[PDB]
């Protein structure tokens, strides 16, 4: 089929050009993370729902 | 009296511009040099006619 046997795959071909989706290191969804802002002198907790 | 680097550069540039469009050389030439080299030899021979106006 004209394909290299050593090619791992795992990418997309859009308009004849190979496209790879780089993974994204994001925060844990629906998880509350707590930290303290030294400049603001406050305790802040954030959740990305 | 001494010539500053900026004054010397301005004098050489003016002399080269004059030589490029006229102003025959006051000294001998090596038959093939650029007008900048002609101005350089004119300065080295101490024959330049261009003076520098200084505030006073």
């Amino acid at each position: 089929l004209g394909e290299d046997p050593k090619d791992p795959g795992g990418y997309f071909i859009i308009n004849g050009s190979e496209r790879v989706i780089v993974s994204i290191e994001d925060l844990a969804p629906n998880k509350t993370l707590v930290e303290r802002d030294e400049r603001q002198n406050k305790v802040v907790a954030k959740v990305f729902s | 009296f001494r010539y500053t680097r900026f004054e010397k550069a301005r004098i050489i540039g003016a002399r080269a511009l004059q030589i490029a469009m006229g102003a025959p050389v006051l000294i001998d030439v090596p038959e093939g040099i650029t007008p900048l080299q002609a101005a350089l030899l004119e300065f080295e021979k101490g024959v330049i006619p261009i003076t520098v106006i200084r505030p006073s």
Binding site: - | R5, F6, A9, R10, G13
Partner: protein, 196 residues
């Protein structure tokens, strides 16, 4: 042309030296590459020397040398087999100068190092523009090398030209060579006059 080792040692080719001018060892080996000794200890690259020793050992014995992290062949073992192969432990070899023909006073460290050619070749990186196409908006040279663009004289270049005190050079660079033009100005109000 950019050539790089596997240990971060990179550089361009400085000279294409003929084989007759290159030095050779007592065993009859002419190096395919010559690197400066100043770069090895400044960057703390001992893995390159270990790889050279391992490559020489692998070439002499015929068995590939394992270079895996933390489980690779020990350096001292490699020096031991290099000694058993008839060569110096340190990998240094007695070399003769290719021009004078005399023996070098220092034993030169020569070994097999995996060097890879990079895609930053000088053929695709040389750009030279005298005059050509200009942008339709700013009447300035185009961008890049594919469309015969110019070279950018940025703000820093202008600043260092000012610091050099070269007023006419700056005028020639920024104005007389990039977007020189003539306009008509009205002296009464300062507006741009129209020429029909």
């Amino acid at each position: 042309d950019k050539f790089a080792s596997r240990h971060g040692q990179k550089g361009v080719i400085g000279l294409i030296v003929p084989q007759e001018d290159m030095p050779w060892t007592e065993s009859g080996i002419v190096p395919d590459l010559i690197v400066n000794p100043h770069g090895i200890p400044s960057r703390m690259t001992v893995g390159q020397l270990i790889e050279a020793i391992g490559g020489k050992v692998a070439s002499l014995t015929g068995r590939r040398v394992d270079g895996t992290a933390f489980i690779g062949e020990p350096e001292e073992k490699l020096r031991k087999e290099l000694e058993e192969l008839g060569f110096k432990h340190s990998g240094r070899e007695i070399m003769y100068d290719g021009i004078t023909g005399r023996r070098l006073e220092a034993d030169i460290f020569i070994g097999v190092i995996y060097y890879q050619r990079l895609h930053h070749m000088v053929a695709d990186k040389m750009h030279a523009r005298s005059r050509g196409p200009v942008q339709v908006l700013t009447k300035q040279p185009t961008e890049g090398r594919a469309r015969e663009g110019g070279l950018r004289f940025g703000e820093m270049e202008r600043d260092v030209l000012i610091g050099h005190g070269a007023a006419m050079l700056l005028i020639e660079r920024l104005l007389e060579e990039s977007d020189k033009t003539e306009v008509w100005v009205c002296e009464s109000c300062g507006h741009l006059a129209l020429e029909d």
